Structures are given as structure tokens and as C-alpha cells.
Design a protein around this ligand. Structure first.
Ligand SMILES: COc1cccc(NC(=O)/C=C/c2ccc(Cl)cc2)c1
Lengths: 537, 126, 57
């Protein structure tokens, strides 16, 4: 029943009356009450908001400082802060859930986060409250990264504490400040691809549904670390792969260009060097195609990318997979004594050459151009193509209806008239390509209407929309290029999982402070020098 | 080169000097990138087409130069969609030409104009 | 060695404590100390910032 999960303590906390709740709990009211009701579940398609089954979780999600302070310090039945809820979301997880991009909500869920963290440190100094995972298996850091909570992430990655005893529960350990210049160490405990669900992996492989996924990577530690990895050990591998792909495309081009044109396939193995080189080119092309096929399948299985919109985040991989599939079809047909493999091979060749733009993401200015070229294809060219096809088909059907040909004669076919009007669109249209009609005025009126509506209105309008879109999405394209390069870095360093790992590691193992247990803090910190001329303290 | 270098002397005049500076900023900033991408597309589709052409019988179009020139003519708005009928599959030829026209003539040049507008608005003062 | 170009006056000035530095120099501490250390060199690719060898600088 609905009215059994709740307790008077829950509603009393809802009213935020400290006196009422302390009166209620003074007799020894249970503090482990779990609100296992559907009204409290996390579902966003239903009314209510999930805050945590425990009343302590409800108080923490709310800004009720006094309630949490008293319950965490009460003489009787002090609630266990580390408490897996029904969904497994510890109070910290519930705080992350409730967090929003709003400034005031960030303030509350950041100050209360720090306070409850220190309180739990006081209660159980040797308890890993921030390493407890829910059923999904993500710690509050990973949960915030997945749900796109930028404020919480910025706090945690830059969490600092000045109290020497409890400073060990900090992320950034400031080292020294010789004047305005001061170093800034970090933690990198879970940021690197060194745990089950890392922050960087979560950001990279999270679908577009999570908001600001490409804006979170602008936090200072992640950006600096990613650029460090790129400049250190991924730029060279990226350039080597780019060169190898250029060689593969050149080999494919040279092999297809010199294809035999006499005799149905397959063709003979001659004793000349030319035929041997041609066969080498063909087999190298096939090997590259099958490699790209398997790489695409591996991407699909590992990522299981979103099926709702996979043309917005996996465009280039889709294109590579299509090229490989076309080449495999061409190989299938070439050995079936069929001569239609030319079409598939040509399509694969053109796709491969156009896919060299995948490698413009290693360069900061061409990457933005590629991102813009893909945003204008999926945003501005599609709509224009839809409207233009509607107009073209309408006026072409009109014209072919007008043409009679009862006597530059086989223009009845809709294909010929549609092609003529498309030629009109590219500025090569003849207004008098045929005189087989019966009313010249109607023909000229239709052609003039088509020219006015498409050539003079739709294309100029397309240029205007492109200008608007560019002005709007310059910054989004920059951030998307940063995210693309991040994904490239992740995949590059993952590829060498069996090759080698030791040198593929960022940060330096440092020991700055101690733990309350009188032991060291061996963590992989990463320096970031800063210079401020106003703090001066 | 000498005739085109008369623009060096437009820096003594306050309104033409800005035009020359903009013409040099758009060459080193916007025309270079567009030329790179356009050459990639042109070479890809031209190699595709010359692969399609067989000429086993407007006949010596096998050379890559002729097809690249034809597609560049497409770019300047003087491209014939049926300049040759030596291929073996008309559908593939037309599909390749249509893809080239859509990607370069209707997307890349209009995009170039948009980028030029953005750059002008950004760098008037510079 | 690194710990020879610096003097107690340099670190005292770093703390920006006037009383400490005047106590240090009251005995007649040398004012011509030169911080000829690589940490103080002008190089921007390395940590530290050049401000001048002299403590007055
Ligand atoms: C990843 O980099 C990019 C960014 C934008 C576009 C492209 N290439 C295509 O869209 C090519 C499309 C296409 C389709 C069919 C045929 Cl027959 C020929 C070409 C690559």
C-alpha cells in the first residue's frame, strides 16, 4: 500500500521544521525508514522526485542543514551514512541525481556535498563513502559524469580543503606558491582509463542524450590531461594511421584504375609484373576493406551506440563501415562471374576518398571545418533537399504532362525532364530544350516559376541559413571537435591493451600528505602551474 | 603576377587597403581550407568516374585530367551531366555526378560564402 | 648548487613581511645578492618567473 513506506518523520522533514522532527525522533523513532514507493522513484515521466529512501537522504537532497546535523550527531540510532538504497543510490548519489545546471541548485548540492562528506569523514574516517557504487556500478563521480552534472564534476575535480586533518579528502593538493606562481596537483584516481567505468570513458561513450557532454570536457583538469596525452603519445600514432590510410587509398585507386576491361571476371594470373602488382593492389584493398568491416562491427558491439540518432555521433564510423561493406559486396560479385562489381568498387573508392576528412580532427582548424560540414549536412542541406525535391518533382511532372511528342524527341520520360530541371538548378538549364509541347506560354510560365522558386529563392535562402547556422554553431563545433579528439585518444590508447600499457599512463605517483591512519597518500597527481596577481595569500 | 601585385599600392588609401587586407586574410584563412576539402572531394569522385569509364568501343576521357577538369567545370557551373556515354552503368555514373554536385556545388560553395561572412564580421577591425 | 644564489632576504621578501626583512637587514645583510639560478631565469617553458637577480628587483 502507498501509505506504508512513508513515516511521520518523512512528512515532518518535508515541512522542514527542526523542532517537530526532533520531537518526533526523541522517543527513539526509527531512522532506517525506506520510502520504497513508486511516487519516490526516479522516473521523470511520472510526478514526484526521487531523493533517497532514507530520511537522511531526503534531508540531504533538501537544504535542511540542521536536520542532517542533528541526525548524524544524535545520541541514539545514528543512521549509517553508507546505505545502498533500492536503486543503490547512496545519499551522495541522490545528491548528484537532484543536482541541476541551475546556479543555486549547484550551490546547495555543492556546499551540502562538502559538509556531509566531512561529517562522514568525522564519523568513519576509514570509510570509503565516495567509492560506494549503486546497482549500475557507478560512483557519484561517474554518475554525475553520465547524467551531465557539470557543477558537481567541477567541484569534485577541484575539491580543496584547508583543514590539515581532513584535507586528505581532497582532490587538488596545492603544492606551493612562490609569489603569484603556484602549482596545482590533481588526483586522477578514476579520471584515467584505469578503472571499470572512468570519467573520461563515460563522457566519451555517453550518447548525445546527456546534456553538455562536450562542454564538461572544458574543465581545466580534463582538458589539460587530454592535450597532454595527445601531445605526448597519440599525435604520432594518429599521423601514422593517417599516412597508412593515405597509402591504402592510393593503392585502391591505382588498382581499380587499371582494372582489366576484357573478359568476364575473374581474370587470369599473367607472368608479367604488371598483373602481379595489380593483384597485390586488389588484395591489399580487400584486406583493408575487411579490416574496416571488422572494426565497425567491433565498434557496434563494444559501444552499442544509440539507435535513436546514430547519424549525429557515429557518422564517420558509419561511413567507414559502408565503404567496407561496398568493397566486400564487390569482392562477392567479382568471384560470381558478374561484371556489376565495378559499381560497388567505384562507390567504395569515392567513399574512401571522401572519408579522408575523418583525419582532419587531429588539426585544430580543419576539425572545426569538418564539424561544420557535417552539421550543415544534417541540419541545413537535408531540409533544402526535401523542399527542392518536392518542387522539382512537381514541376517536372507538370512539364512531362505538357509534352506530347506526337510528331530532342524522347523527352517524355520523367527522368529526362527532372534532369533538365536539375541542370536549371546548377545553372546549365536551357529554357527551350524542346519544342514538342502544344502551348509555349504554359511551358515558359512553368519553367520561369521553377527558376524563380528554386534558383532565385531556395539557393539564396540556403546561403542565408548557412550563414545563420555558422554564426550560431561556431562554438558548438569547437567543442564537438574537442570531444572527437578525446574519443580518438581513448580508442588509440585502448588499442594497445595487449601491446603495452606502462608507458601509456598519465600523471606521476606522488606522496604529499597523510591519512588520519598515519600513512601516506600515494596518488597519480598531474601538475598545473597557475599565476594570479590578486589572490596574493 | 606583376599585374596582380598592383594591389600592394592600395595601402596608401584607407578604404582599398582594408579590402586588400581582407582579400589576403580570406585567402590564408578561408580559401585554403575550402580548397583542401574540395580537392579531396574532386579527386575522389574523379578517380571513381575514370574507374567507371571503360572506352572499349568524347572517347579519350579515360585520362584522370579530363575527368577532373570536367568536375571542376561542374564547380564553375559549366558541367555537362552527360558529357560521355562510354560507361557501362548509367545509374552509377549519374549517382556519382549528383553526389559530387550536391557535396561541392550546393554545400561547399554556399558554406564558403557563409564562412566568408563570418570572417568579415570578425576581422573588420583587425 | 641551487641553494646558494638565494639568501634569507629573498625568501623574507617573498613572504612580504616588512618587519622580518628589516630585522634581517638591520645587522647589515648584503643587498647585492644575485639570484643566478635557472629557476629564476626568464624561460617560459620552465617553472618559475624571472623578476631580477637583485632583491630590490
Ligand atoms: C567524416 O567526414 C565527412 C564529413 C562529411 C561528409 C563526408 N562524406 C560523405 O558524406 C559522402 C557521402 C557519399 C554518399 C554516397 C556516395 Cl555514392 C558518395 C559519397 C565525410
Amino acid at each position: 500500500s502507498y501509505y506504508k513506506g512513508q513515516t511521520a518523520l518523512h512528512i515532518a522533514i518535508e515541512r522542514r521544521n527542526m523542532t517537530l522532527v526532533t520531537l518526533l525522533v526523541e522517543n527513539g523513532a526509527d531512522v532506517q525508514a525506506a520510502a520504497n514507493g513508486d511516487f519516490f522513484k526516479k522516473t521523470k515521466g511520472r510526478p514526484g522526485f526521487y531523493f533517497g529512501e532514507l530520511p537522511l537522504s531526503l534531508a540531504a537532497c533538501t537544504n535542511q542543514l540542521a536536520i542532517v546535523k542533528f541526525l548524524l550527531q544524535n545520541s541514539w540510532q545514528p543512521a549509517d551514512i553508507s546505505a545502498r538504497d533500492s536503486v543503490g543510490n547512496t545519499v551522495l548519489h541522490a545528491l548528484v541525481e537532484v543536482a541541476d545546471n541551475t546556479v543555486d541548485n549547484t550551490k546547495f548540492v555543492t556546499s551540502m556535498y562538502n559538509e556531509i562528506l566531512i561529517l562522514g569523514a568525522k564519523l568513519h574516517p576509514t570509510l570509503k563513502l565516495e567509492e560506494i557504487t549503486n546497482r549500475k556500478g557507478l560512483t557519484p563521480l561517474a554518475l554525475a559524469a553520465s547524467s551531465g552534472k557539470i557543477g558537481v564534476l567541477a567541484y569534485i575535480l577541484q575539491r580543496e580543503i584547508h583543514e590539515p586533518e581532513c584535507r586528505h579528502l581532497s582532490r587538488k593538493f596545492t603544492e606551493w606558491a612562490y609569489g603569484p606562481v603556484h602549482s596545482s596537483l590533481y588526483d586522477l584516481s578514476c579520471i584515467d582509463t584505469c578503472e571499470k567505468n572512468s570519467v573520461l570513458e563515460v563522457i566519451a561513450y555517453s550518447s548525445s542524450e546527456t546534456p553538455n557532454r562536450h562542454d564538461m570536457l572544458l574543465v581545466e583538469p580534463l582538458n589539460r590531461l587530454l592535450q597532454d596525452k595527445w601531445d605526448r603519445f597519440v599525435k604520432r600514432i594518429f599521423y601514422f594511421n593517417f599516412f597508412v590510410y593515405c597509402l591504402y587509398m592510393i593503392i585502391f585507386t591505382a588498382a581499380a584504375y587499371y582494372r582489366p576491361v576484357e573478359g568476364l571476371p575473374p581474370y587470369k594470373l599473367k607472368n608479367t609484373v604488371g598483373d602481379y602488382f595489380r593483384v597485390t593492389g586488389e588484395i591489399l584493398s580487400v584486406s583493408g576493406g575487411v579490416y574496416f568491416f571488422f572494426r565497425g562491427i567491433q565498434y557496434f558491439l563494444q559501444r552499442r551506440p544509440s539507435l535513436k540518432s546514430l547519424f549525429v555521433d557515429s557518422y564517420s564510423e558509419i561511413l567507414f563501415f559502408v565503404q567496407s561493406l561496398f568493397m566486400l559486396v564487390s569482392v562477392v560479385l567479382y568471384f560470381s562471374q558478374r561484371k556489376e562489381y565495378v559499381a560497388s568498387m567505384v562507390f567504395s573508392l569515392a567513399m574512401g576518398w571522401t572519408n579522408m576528412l575523418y583525419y582532419t580532427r587531429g588539426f585544430q582548424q580543419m576539425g572545426i571545418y569538418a564539424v561544420m560540414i557535417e552539421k550543415m549536412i544534417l541540419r541545413d542541406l537535408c531540409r533544402f533537399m526535401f523542399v527542392y525535391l518536392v518542387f522539382l518533382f512537381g514541376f517536372s511532372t507538370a512539364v512531362v504532362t505538357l509534352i506530347e511528342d506526337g510528331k530532342g524527341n524522347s523527352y517524355n520520360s520523367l527522368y529526362s525532364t527532372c534532369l533538365e530541371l536539375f541542370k536549371f538548378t546548377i545553372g546549365m538549364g536551357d529554357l527551350e530544350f524542346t519544342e514538342n509541347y502544344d502551348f509555349k506560354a504554359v511551358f515558359i510560365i512553368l519553367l520561369l516559376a521553377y527558376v524563380i522558386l528554386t534558383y532565385i529563392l531556395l539557393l539564396n535562402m540556403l546561403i542565408a541559413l548557412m550563414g545563420e547556422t555558422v554564426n550560431k554553431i561556431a562554438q558548438e563545433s569547437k567543442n564537438i571537435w574537442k570531444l572527437q579528439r578525446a574519443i580518438t585518444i581513448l580508442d588509440t590508447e585502448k588499442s594497445f591493451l595487449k601491446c603495452m600499457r606502462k608507458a601509456f599512463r598519465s600523471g606521476k605517483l606522488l606522496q604529499v600528505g597523510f591519512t588520519p591512519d598515519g600513512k601516506d597518500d600515494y596518488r597519480w597527481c598531474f601538475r598545473v602551474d597557475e599565476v594570479n596577481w590578486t589572490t596574493w595569500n
